[PDB]
Amino acid sequence: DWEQYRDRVNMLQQERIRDSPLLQAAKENDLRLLKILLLNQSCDFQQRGAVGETALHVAALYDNLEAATLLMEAAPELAKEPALCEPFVGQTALHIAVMNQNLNLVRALLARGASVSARATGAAFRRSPHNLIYYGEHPLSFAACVGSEEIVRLLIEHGADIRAQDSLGNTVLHILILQPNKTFACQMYNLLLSYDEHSDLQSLELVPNHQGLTPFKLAGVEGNTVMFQHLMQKRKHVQWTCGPLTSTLYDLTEIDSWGEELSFLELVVSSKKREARQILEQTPVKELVSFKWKKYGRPYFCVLASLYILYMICFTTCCIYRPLKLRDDNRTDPRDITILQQKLLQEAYVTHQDNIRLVGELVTVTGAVIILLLEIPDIFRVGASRYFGQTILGGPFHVIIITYASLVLLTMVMRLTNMNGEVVPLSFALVLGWCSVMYFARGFQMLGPFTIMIQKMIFGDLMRFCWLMAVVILGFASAFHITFQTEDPNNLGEFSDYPTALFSTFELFLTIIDGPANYSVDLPFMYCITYAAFAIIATLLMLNLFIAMMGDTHWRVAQERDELWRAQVVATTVMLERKMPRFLWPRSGICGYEYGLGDRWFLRVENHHD
Amino acid sequence: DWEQYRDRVNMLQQERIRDSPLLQAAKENDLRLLKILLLNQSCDFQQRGAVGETALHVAALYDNLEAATLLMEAAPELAKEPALCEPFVGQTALHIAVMNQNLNLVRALLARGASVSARATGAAFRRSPHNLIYYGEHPLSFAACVGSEEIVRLLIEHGADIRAQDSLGNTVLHILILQPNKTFACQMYNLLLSYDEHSDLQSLELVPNHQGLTPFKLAGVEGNTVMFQHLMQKRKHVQWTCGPLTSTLYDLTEIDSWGEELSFLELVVSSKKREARQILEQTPVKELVSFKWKKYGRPYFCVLASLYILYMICFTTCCIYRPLKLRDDNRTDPRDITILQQKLLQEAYVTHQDNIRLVGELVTVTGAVIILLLEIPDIFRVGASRYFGQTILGGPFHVIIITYASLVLLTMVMRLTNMNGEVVPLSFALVLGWCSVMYFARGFQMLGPFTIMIQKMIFGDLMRFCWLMAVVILGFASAFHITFQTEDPNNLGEFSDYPTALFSTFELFLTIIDGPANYSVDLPFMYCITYAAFAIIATLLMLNLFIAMMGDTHWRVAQERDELWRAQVVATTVMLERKMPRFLWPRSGICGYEYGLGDRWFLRVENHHD
Ligand SMILES: CC(C)[C@@H](C)/C=C/[C@@H](C)[C@H]1CC[C@H]2C3=CC=C4C[C@@H](O)CC[C@]4(C)[C@H]3CC[C@]12C
Ligand SMILES: CC(C)[C@@H](C)/C=C/[C@@H](C)[C@H]1CC[C@H]2C3=CC=C4C[C@@H](O)CC[C@]4(C)[C@H]3CC[C@]12C
Ligand SMILES: CC(C)[C@@H](C)/C=C/[C@@H](C)[C@H]1CC[C@H]2C3=CC=C4C[C@@H](O)CC[C@]4(C)[C@H]3CC[C@]12C
Ligand SMILES: CC(C)[C@@H](C)/C=C/[C@@H](C)[C@H]1CC[C@H]2C3=CC=C4C[C@@H](O)CC[C@]4(C)[C@H]3CC[C@]12C
């Protein structure tokens, strides 16, 4: 929760420990004062602290086995007392004794009758970035997550339910997977699977949490590669081993996820963790997505890319041959250079070429409607921020594709209603529609990690550098405008108006226009000093600083090009499996039923070991 | 072959193993059930699997020595039974027993009379990228490639022919060289040479395969540097060793390859493997090509470069002084600026300077004919794709040189036929002919690894980045054309026509022209927003991204500059040895016959060891 509230809670807990002499003796392991208190019978033994902790909780917290046994000899009901305050509600002495790995204290508490199924629904025991650890809500979950196998065996022998869930629905396998240390996690997973004598019901592995994730899916989502390898070791079958050639037969019941709302690969790719992209490098998943991409994903993606390119060619040809007529009125203003205008709806669609344009425009409108019908339910199937905010699963390409379809439909509306100004949505749709073709650059290895470079340059570096650049533009444009306020605009009109001054200074920042010079006339002397300062500071230092930032970003992406391209391949394959019809996408892998191996589907992997 | 077919074959093989109780007992090493089957006499013992494998093949496949001896005690004819299906045709139990290194099983099979010359012509035993290994087609080849020397000795003692070839003609030395692991390969090569008691016939080393490669040539082609060093250890003679100076005398019978169609160095350089360029760094080859390049290659290459430069000077001077006359007709169109045209064949070649031009044009046509006569039979001596598609042996320089000669001859044809439009082939030939002079940059160390940088930037990076760049050009050119469709073209004519809009936006992408600005008139407001987006996205992000890609490509080539330059030196020296007359290229090395060492030719290497 709040850091200040937890600090006040800890300070109040230490204050109530230091104020109470029984709690002070329990903390400091003062056996004489504690025995004088307990042998004495002032009739008080349940003094609670600031968090509602008993004296047994204080004895277990500071590793005081002798003081805890003294507190359990007299009035042993403290072995069945949880805390009664917000940051530690539900925590007993058994939880602290398990977390401190005091095995004799856990033995003594289970001898005195500790609650082995004590569900600690505390604020500090929830999975949150405020808490440093998430060990669970049960003593068995705590003992499995800490790493003491003997305490796990002791709690199981006393009757701790392995199939117990948290507030998030997580069983002990989920919280065991969620731990960062993974050396002992595989052995603890083996121990908890070995103690599943129940085996009735479904196996603990098939138990989903409240998010609907199995432990296999949670190992996929969180990027736990070691637990993923340990899980696939239990689901593989070595067919044969001849010399150095080992042929094994992995099971694809959970990896492929046939007939499910969210497949395993979709959950792996659409994950906020950076370590989830290493699951695609693992042994069954890499061969599975390579088979899917090489057999079905690449030809279908190339066909869709060719259709989209021809569609954009038709839209561009309809933009070029747009119906325009001569201007009716006279150009009274000498600075106005508009000689054509848009024809009316009655004036257009007359000749044969206009009917060809009508056919192409119907093709364009139908394609935009098809685009909207393909993209709109994906914003409601998952979250809008998740669908619009991930690099791997398209992302900004979907936003500009939906914007392109919306602008094409708006152009159609303005065409049918005889509204002037189709140049703005047609230019927007021509820029956005052609730039969306780079989405289909993710289907090729050489060009795919380039769109990721451009994405991590625009939203990565350009959105940070544009504030300093805009500050320099807003300074020097105002300076250049006020130096040329008392000047004739016919000789040097690059700073005549302040919007034009902003645009001209932006161009001079990017060095795409020449410096404003008119040597036939006498420019003001302040312009030369201001432009020398602009050339030193803006065009030389900051522009090449942005060039170096883009170079470092390109190097950072190019050091991990194949991983990002494989992630894009899996994202594209998942999207094509979800959206295309099922008869064009047969089920991947060996059928297995024709070979007598049941209804499961397998992937055969032949490797060259030693 | 196909991955799905091999997967179906393996699944069917495991299905037929699991269905048959004899094969199941042979796989699982169930001695009791197997003895009940064999001691029983249901009169069946040759049940074949899905691949035609016997029960002895299943026993040898899963390392079941006891089950294999039980299957060989009753009906031992299974020791002489190969498989009878496509992926394993010709494979016996001896092959699997050798590959599994079960020495007692190989002893038992040779005791029962296994076929020691069993030629396994299977689909899985062929050298292909589908197969993970290529161990050969014979049990001796399998035992030499796996690494068990005792099984090699056992097979040789029973009469396995060492001089046996595969479907590719490869003997056991070729397949032993083709293995990736090279520590045991030298010892196995020594063992197989030591067992060549035949020594009649030619030595196994001089036995070529179906591609015509000796094991020395195959070690050169595949880049096996360790086997190359081991082969040159057997062909060197240490003349003396005084202090730290060791003078040895390498033999150049196979490295130089006098009087052969394909020399050793040509096969090393024209190799698809990247590791073949390390053969040129080895001890005799480096000194040999350095002697050849320093004595003969560099002066002849500099003479040819000077002749080609003077030839291009003559061609350029004939292009500058091209016969042109005043235009006969009148310039009716105000946008037409053509004032000259080409003179007729009768009108030209009149004055003295025209006769000097005629002499130069005859020189140019003769040089192009000489160029075609030098380059045309090289396209038929080797493959066309091999000759036109390798960086080291010229490659694109040969294509542009042949194109230059073809365009010069086409210009001559258009000159003789009075056909208008010599400017197109003359401009093409002037661009391509002068750019071919960079071919002669490969003869100098400092400038040579620069043409490789440009080649790996054009075909490496430019051919990948040009699709995204063309996408941005096709978007923004159409946007800029439709914003200036309803505008007067006299004020801003950079986007008047769509081809001119494409060209102007390509120039604005490369920042070689200024931004289109006409401050005397009022430009449309959409142009400013579209050009600000073009300046942000195209000229700033993508152009400098391509700059960073070229920087990384230049760094990648510059980290290996000397290796690539030495490869180009060997390629140039091989080309000059092949194409120049023999009297200008004396045989390299010590003659040897005058010193009583036979007809062989030697290279003396003096090195400073310790
Ligand atoms: C038309 C003008 C007014 C302005 C709006 C135009 C903006 C275009 C050029 C910009 C806006 C956002 C840009 C953009 C958004 C995000 C991505 C995803 C990235 O992975 C590749 C580049 C890509 C695809 C680029 C392409 C160019 C876009 C679409
Ligand atoms: C430096 C960063 C922030 C980049 C991205 C922004 C550039 C700014 C300065 C650019 C982007 C688009 C430009 C722009 C849009 C359109 C017009 C209308 C035109 O008739 C006058 C110039 C004017 C008013 C300019 C002003 C400067 C703008 C707003
Ligand atoms: C004349 C115009 C129309 C066009 C066709 C001209 C193209 C020229 C400039 C281009 C085409 C291909 C280019 C090219 C091909 C390949 C190589 C081999 C490389 O190792 C060095 C650069 C070099 C030699 C370059 C030189 C420049 C060339 C020849
Ligand atoms: C971005 C990459 C793909 C680079 C290599 C390609 C550039 C394209 C856009 C260039 C290359 C040559 C250019 C070109 C060739 C010749 C002409 C004829 C001229 O009268 C009008 C422009 C026009 C029609 C332009 C159009 C744009 C072209 C085709």
CSV table of N, CA and C in Angstrom, one decimal, chain B residues 75-182:
chain,number,residue,atom,x,y,z
B,75,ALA,N,17.3,-68.4,-35.5
B,75,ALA,CA,17.2,-67.9,-36.9
B,75,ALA,C,18.2,-66.7,-37.1
B,76,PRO,N,19.5,-67.0,-37.2
B,76,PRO,CA,20.6,-66.0,-37.3
B,76,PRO,C,20.6,-65.2,-38.6
B,77,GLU,N,19.7,-65.6,-39.6
B,77,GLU,CA,19.6,-65.0,-40.9
B,77,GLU,C,19.2,-63.5,-40.8
B,78,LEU,N,18.7,-63.0,-39.7
B,78,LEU,CA,18.4,-61.6,-39.5
B,78,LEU,C,19.7,-60.8,-39.4
B,79,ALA,N,20.9,-61.4,-39.2
B,79,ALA,CA,22.1,-60.7,-39.4
B,79,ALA,C,22.4,-60.3,-40.8
B,80,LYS,N,21.7,-60.8,-41.8
B,80,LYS,CA,22.0,-60.5,-43.2
B,80,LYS,C,20.7,-60.0,-43.8
B,81,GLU,N,19.9,-59.1,-43.1
B,81,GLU,CA,18.7,-58.6,-43.6
B,81,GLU,C,18.7,-57.1,-43.5
B,82,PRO,N,18.6,-56.4,-44.7
B,82,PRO,CA,18.5,-54.9,-44.7
B,82,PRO,C,17.0,-54.5,-44.7
B,83,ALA,N,16.8,-53.2,-44.4
B,83,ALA,CA,15.4,-52.7,-44.4
B,83,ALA,C,14.9,-52.5,-45.8
B,84,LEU,N,13.6,-52.6,-46.0
B,84,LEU,CA,13.0,-52.6,-47.3
B,84,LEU,C,12.0,-51.5,-47.5
B,85,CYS,N,12.4,-50.3,-47.2
B,85,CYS,CA,11.5,-49.1,-47.3
B,85,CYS,C,12.4,-47.9,-47.6
B,86,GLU,N,11.7,-46.8,-48.0
B,86,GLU,CA,12.4,-45.7,-48.6
B,86,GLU,C,13.4,-44.9,-47.7
B,87,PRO,N,13.1,-44.5,-46.5
B,87,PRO,CA,14.1,-43.7,-45.7
B,87,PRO,C,15.2,-44.5,-45.1
B,88,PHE,N,15.2,-45.9,-45.2
B,88,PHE,CA,16.3,-46.7,-44.6
B,88,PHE,C,16.7,-47.8,-45.5
B,89,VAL,N,16.6,-47.7,-46.8
B,89,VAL,CA,16.9,-48.8,-47.7
B,89,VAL,C,18.4,-49.1,-47.7
B,90,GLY,N,18.7,-50.4,-47.4
B,90,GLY,CA,20.1,-50.8,-47.3
B,90,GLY,C,20.7,-50.8,-46.0
B,91,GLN,N,20.0,-50.3,-45.0
B,91,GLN,CA,20.5,-50.2,-43.6
B,91,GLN,C,20.3,-51.6,-42.9
B,92,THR,N,21.4,-52.2,-42.4
B,92,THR,CA,21.4,-53.4,-41.7
B,92,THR,C,21.5,-53.1,-40.2
B,93,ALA,N,21.5,-54.2,-39.4
B,93,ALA,CA,21.8,-54.1,-38.0
B,93,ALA,C,23.2,-53.7,-37.7
B,94,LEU,N,24.1,-54.0,-38.6
B,94,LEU,CA,25.5,-53.7,-38.4
B,94,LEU,C,25.7,-52.1,-38.4
B,95,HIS,N,25.0,-51.4,-39.2
B,95,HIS,CA,25.1,-50.0,-39.3
B,95,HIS,C,24.6,-49.3,-38.0
B,96,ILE,N,23.5,-49.8,-37.4
B,96,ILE,CA,23.0,-49.3,-36.2
B,96,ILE,C,23.9,-49.7,-35.0
B,97,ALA,N,24.4,-50.9,-35.0
B,97,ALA,CA,25.3,-51.3,-34.0
B,97,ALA,C,26.6,-50.6,-34.0
B,98,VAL,N,27.1,-50.2,-35.2
B,98,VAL,CA,28.3,-49.4,-35.3
B,98,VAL,C,28.0,-47.9,-34.8
B,99,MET,N,26.9,-47.4,-35.2
B,99,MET,CA,26.6,-46.0,-34.9
B,99,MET,C,26.3,-45.9,-33.4
B,100,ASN,N,25.8,-46.9,-32.7
B,100,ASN,CA,25.6,-46.9,-31.3
B,100,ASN,C,26.8,-47.2,-30.5
B,101,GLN,N,27.9,-47.6,-31.2
B,101,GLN,CA,29.2,-47.9,-30.6
B,101,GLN,C,29.1,-49.1,-29.6
B,102,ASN,N,28.2,-50.0,-29.9
B,102,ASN,CA,28.1,-51.3,-29.2
B,102,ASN,C,29.1,-52.3,-29.7
B,103,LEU,N,30.3,-52.3,-29.2
B,103,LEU,CA,31.4,-53.1,-29.7
B,103,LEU,C,31.1,-54.6,-29.6
B,104,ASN,N,30.5,-55.0,-28.5
B,104,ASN,CA,30.2,-56.5,-28.4
B,104,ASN,C,29.1,-56.9,-29.4
B,105,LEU,N,28.2,-55.9,-29.7
B,105,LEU,CA,27.1,-56.2,-30.7
B,105,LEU,C,27.7,-56.3,-32.1
B,106,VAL,N,28.7,-55.5,-32.4
B,106,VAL,CA,29.4,-55.6,-33.7
B,106,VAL,C,30.2,-56.9,-33.8
B,107,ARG,N,30.8,-57.3,-32.7
B,107,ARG,CA,31.5,-58.5,-32.6
B,107,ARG,C,30.6,-59.7,-32.8
B,108,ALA,N,29.4,-59.7,-32.2
B,108,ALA,CA,28.4,-60.7,-32.4
B,108,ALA,C,27.9,-60.8,-33.8
B,109,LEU,N,27.6,-59.6,-34.4
B,109,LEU,CA,27.1,-59.6,-35.7
B,109,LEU,C,28.1,-60.0,-36.7
B,110,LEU,N,29.4,-59.7,-36.5
B,110,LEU,CA,30.4,-60.2,-37.4
B,110,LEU,C,30.7,-61.7,-37.2
B,111,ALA,N,30.4,-62.2,-36.0
B,111,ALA,CA,30.5,-63.6,-35.7
B,111,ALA,C,29.4,-64.3,-36.4
B,112,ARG,N,28.2,-63.8,-36.5
B,112,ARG,CA,27.0,-64.4,-37.2
B,112,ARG,C,27.0,-64.1,-38.6
B,113,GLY,N,28.0,-63.3,-39.2
B,113,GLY,CA,28.1,-63.1,-40.6
B,113,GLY,C,27.3,-61.9,-41.1
B,114,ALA,N,27.6,-60.7,-40.5
B,114,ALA,CA,27.0,-59.5,-41.0
B,114,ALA,C,27.6,-59.1,-42.3
B,115,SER,N,26.9,-58.4,-43.2
B,115,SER,CA,27.4,-57.9,-44.4
B,115,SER,C,28.3,-56.7,-44.1
B,116,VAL,N,29.6,-56.9,-44.3
B,116,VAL,CA,30.5,-55.8,-43.9
B,116,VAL,C,30.6,-54.7,-45.0
B,117,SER,N,30.1,-55.0,-46.2
B,117,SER,CA,30.0,-54.1,-47.3
B,117,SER,C,28.6,-53.7,-47.7
B,118,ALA,N,27.8,-53.5,-46.6
B,118,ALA,CA,26.3,-53.2,-46.8
B,118,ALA,C,26.2,-51.8,-47.2
B,119,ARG,N,25.9,-51.6,-48.5
B,119,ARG,CA,25.7,-50.2,-49.1
B,119,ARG,C,24.3,-49.7,-48.8
B,120,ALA,N,24.2,-48.8,-47.8
B,120,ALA,CA,22.9,-48.3,-47.4
B,120,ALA,C,22.6,-47.1,-48.3
B,121,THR,N,21.8,-47.3,-49.3
B,121,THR,CA,21.4,-46.2,-50.2
B,121,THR,C,20.1,-45.6,-49.8
B,122,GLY,N,20.0,-45.2,-48.5
B,122,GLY,CA,18.7,-44.7,-47.9
B,122,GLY,C,18.6,-43.2,-48.2
B,123,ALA,N,17.3,-42.7,-48.0
B,123,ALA,CA,17.1,-41.3,-48.1
B,123,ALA,C,17.6,-40.5,-46.9
B,124,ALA,N,17.7,-41.2,-45.8
B,124,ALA,CA,18.3,-40.5,-44.6
B,124,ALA,C,19.8,-40.6,-44.5
B,125,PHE,N,20.4,-41.4,-45.4
B,125,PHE,CA,21.9,-41.5,-45.4
B,125,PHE,C,22.6,-40.7,-46.4
B,126,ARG,N,21.8,-39.8,-47.2
B,126,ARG,CA,22.4,-39.0,-48.2
B,126,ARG,C,22.8,-37.7,-47.6
B,127,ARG,N,23.8,-37.0,-48.2
B,127,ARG,CA,24.3,-35.7,-47.8
B,127,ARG,C,23.3,-34.7,-48.2
B,128,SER,N,22.5,-34.1,-47.3
B,128,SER,CA,21.5,-33.1,-47.6
B,128,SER,C,21.3,-32.3,-46.4
B,129,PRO,N,20.7,-31.0,-46.6
B,129,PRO,CA,20.4,-30.2,-45.4
B,129,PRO,C,19.2,-30.8,-44.6
B,130,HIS,N,18.4,-31.7,-45.2
B,130,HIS,CA,17.4,-32.4,-44.4
B,130,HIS,C,17.9,-33.3,-43.4
B,131,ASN,N,19.0,-34.0,-43.7
B,131,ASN,CA,19.7,-34.9,-42.7
B,131,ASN,C,20.6,-34.1,-41.8
B,132,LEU,N,20.6,-34.4,-40.5
B,132,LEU,CA,21.5,-33.7,-39.6
B,132,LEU,C,22.9,-34.2,-39.7
B,133,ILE,N,23.2,-35.4,-40.1
B,133,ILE,CA,24.5,-36.0,-40.3
B,133,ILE,C,24.6,-36.6,-41.6
B,134,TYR,N,25.9,-36.7,-42.1
B,134,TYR,CA,26.3,-37.5,-43.3
B,134,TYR,C,27.5,-38.3,-42.8
B,135,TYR,N,27.2,-39.6,-42.5
B,135,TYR,CA,28.3,-40.5,-42.0
B,135,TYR,C,28.7,-41.4,-43.1
B,136,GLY,N,28.0,-41.6,-44.2
B,136,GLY,CA,28.4,-42.4,-45.3
B,136,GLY,C,27.4,-43.4,-45.7
B,137,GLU,N,27.8,-44.4,-46.4
B,137,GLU,CA,26.9,-45.5,-46.8
B,137,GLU,C,27.5,-46.9,-46.4
B,138,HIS,N,28.6,-46.9,-45.7
B,138,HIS,CA,29.3,-48.2,-45.4
B,138,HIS,C,29.5,-48.3,-43.9
B,139,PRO,N,29.6,-49.5,-43.3
B,139,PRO,CA,29.9,-49.6,-41.9
B,139,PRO,C,31.3,-49.1,-41.5
B,140,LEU,N,32.3,-49.2,-42.4
B,140,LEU,CA,33.6,-48.6,-42.2
B,140,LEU,C,33.5,-47.1,-42.1
B,141,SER,N,32.7,-46.5,-43.1
B,141,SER,CA,32.5,-45.0,-43.1
B,141,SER,C,31.8,-44.6,-41.8
B,142,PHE,N,30.8,-45.3,-41.4
B,142,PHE,CA,30.1,-45.0,-40.1
B,142,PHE,C,31.0,-45.1,-38.9
B,143,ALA,N,31.8,-46.1,-38.8
B,143,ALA,CA,32.7,-46.3,-37.7
B,143,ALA,C,33.8,-45.2,-37.7
B,144,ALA,N,34.3,-44.8,-38.9
B,144,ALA,CA,35.3,-43.8,-39.0
B,144,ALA,C,34.7,-42.4,-38.6
B,145,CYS,N,33.5,-42.2,-39.0
B,145,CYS,CA,32.9,-40.9,-38.7
B,145,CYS,C,32.4,-40.7,-37.3
B,146,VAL,N,32.0,-41.8,-36.7
B,146,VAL,CA,31.5,-41.7,-35.3
B,146,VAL,C,32.7,-41.5,-34.3
B,147,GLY,N,33.8,-42.3,-34.4
B,147,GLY,CA,35.0,-42.0,-33.7
B,147,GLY,C,35.5,-43.2,-32.9
B,148,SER,N,35.0,-44.4,-33.0
B,148,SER,CA,35.4,-45.6,-32.4
B,148,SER,C,36.5,-46.2,-33.2
B,149,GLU,N,37.8,-46.1,-32.8
B,149,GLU,CA,38.9,-46.7,-33.6
B,149,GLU,C,38.9,-48.2,-33.5
B,150,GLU,N,38.4,-48.8,-32.4
B,150,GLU,CA,38.5,-50.2,-32.2
B,150,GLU,C,37.5,-50.9,-33.2
B,151,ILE,N,36.3,-50.3,-33.4
B,151,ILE,CA,35.4,-50.8,-34.4
B,151,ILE,C,35.9,-50.7,-35.8
B,152,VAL,N,36.7,-49.6,-36.1
B,152,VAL,CA,37.3,-49.5,-37.4
B,152,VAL,C,38.3,-50.6,-37.6
B,153,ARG,N,39.1,-50.9,-36.6
B,153,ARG,CA,40.1,-52.0,-36.7
B,153,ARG,C,39.4,-53.3,-36.8
B,154,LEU,N,38.3,-53.5,-36.1
B,154,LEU,CA,37.5,-54.7,-36.2
B,154,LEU,C,36.9,-54.9,-37.6
B,155,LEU,N,36.4,-53.9,-38.2
B,155,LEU,CA,35.8,-54.0,-39.5
B,155,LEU,C,36.8,-54.2,-40.6
B,156,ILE,N,38.0,-53.6,-40.4
B,156,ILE,CA,39.1,-53.7,-41.4
B,156,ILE,C,39.6,-55.2,-41.3
B,157,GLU,N,39.8,-55.7,-40.1
B,157,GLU,CA,40.2,-57.1,-39.9
B,157,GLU,C,39.3,-58.1,-40.5
B,158,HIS,N,38.0,-57.8,-40.6
B,158,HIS,CA,37.0,-58.7,-41.2
B,158,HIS,C,36.9,-58.5,-42.7
B,159,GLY,N,37.5,-57.5,-43.3
B,159,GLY,CA,37.5,-57.4,-44.7
B,159,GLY,C,36.7,-56.3,-45.3
B,160,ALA,N,36.5,-55.2,-44.6
B,160,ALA,CA,35.8,-54.0,-45.1
B,160,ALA,C,36.7,-53.3,-46.1
B,161,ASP,N,36.2,-53.0,-47.3
B,161,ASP,CA,37.0,-52.3,-48.3
B,161,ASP,C,37.1,-50.9,-48.0
B,162,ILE,N,38.4,-50.4,-47.8
B,162,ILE,CA,38.6,-49.0,-47.5
B,162,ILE,C,38.3,-48.1,-48.8
B,163,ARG,N,38.5,-48.7,-50.0
B,163,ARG,CA,38.3,-48.0,-51.2
B,163,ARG,C,36.9,-48.2,-51.8
B,164,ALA,N,35.9,-47.8,-50.9
B,164,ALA,CA,34.5,-47.9,-51.3
B,164,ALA,C,33.9,-46.5,-51.3
B,165,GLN,N,33.0,-46.3,-52.3
B,165,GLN,CA,32.5,-45.0,-52.5
B,165,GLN,C,31.0,-44.9,-52.3
B,166,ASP,N,30.5,-43.7,-52.1
B,166,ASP,CA,29.1,-43.5,-51.8
B,166,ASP,C,28.3,-43.2,-53.2
B,167,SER,N,27.1,-42.7,-53.1
B,167,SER,CA,26.4,-42.2,-54.2
B,167,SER,C,27.0,-41.0,-54.8
B,168,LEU,N,27.7,-40.2,-54.0
B,168,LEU,CA,28.4,-39.0,-54.4
B,168,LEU,C,29.9,-39.4,-54.8
B,169,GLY,N,30.2,-40.6,-54.7
B,169,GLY,CA,31.6,-41.0,-55.0
B,169,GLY,C,32.6,-40.9,-53.9
B,170,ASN,N,32.1,-40.4,-52.7
B,170,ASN,CA,33.0,-40.1,-51.6
B,170,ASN,C,33.5,-41.4,-50.9
B,171,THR,N,34.8,-41.5,-50.8
B,171,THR,CA,35.4,-42.6,-50.0
B,171,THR,C,35.4,-42.2,-48.6
B,172,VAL,N,36.0,-43.0,-47.7
B,172,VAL,CA,35.9,-42.8,-46.3
B,172,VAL,C,36.7,-41.6,-45.8
B,173,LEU,N,37.7,-41.2,-46.6
B,173,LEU,CA,38.5,-40.0,-46.3
B,173,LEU,C,37.7,-38.8,-46.5
B,174,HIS,N,36.9,-38.7,-47.6
B,174,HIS,CA,36.0,-37.6,-47.9
B,174,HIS,C,35.0,-37.4,-46.8
B,175,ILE,N,34.3,-38.4,-46.4
B,175,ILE,CA,33.3,-38.3,-45.4
B,175,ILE,C,33.9,-38.0,-44.0
B,176,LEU,N,35.1,-38.5,-43.8
B,176,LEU,CA,35.8,-38.2,-42.6
B,176,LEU,C,36.2,-36.7,-42.5
B,177,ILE,N,36.6,-36.2,-43.7
B,177,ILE,CA,36.9,-34.7,-43.7
B,177,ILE,C,35.6,-33.9,-43.5
B,178,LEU,N,34.5,-34.4,-44.0
B,178,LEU,CA,33.2,-33.7,-44.0
B,178,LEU,C,32.6,-33.5,-42.6
B,179,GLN,N,33.2,-34.3,-41.6
B,179,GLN,CA,32.6,-34.2,-40.2
B,179,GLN,C,33.0,-32.8,-39.6
B,180,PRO,N,32.1,-32.3,-38.7
B,180,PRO,CA,32.4,-31.0,-38.1
B,180,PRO,C,33.4,-31.2,-37.0
B,181,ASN,N,33.4,-32.2,-36.2
B,181,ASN,CA,34.4,-32.4,-35.1
B,181,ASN,C,35.7,-32.9,-35.8
B,182,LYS,N,36.8,-32.2,-35.4
B,182,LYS,CA,38.1,-32.4,-36.1
B,182,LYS,C,39.2,-32.9,-35.2
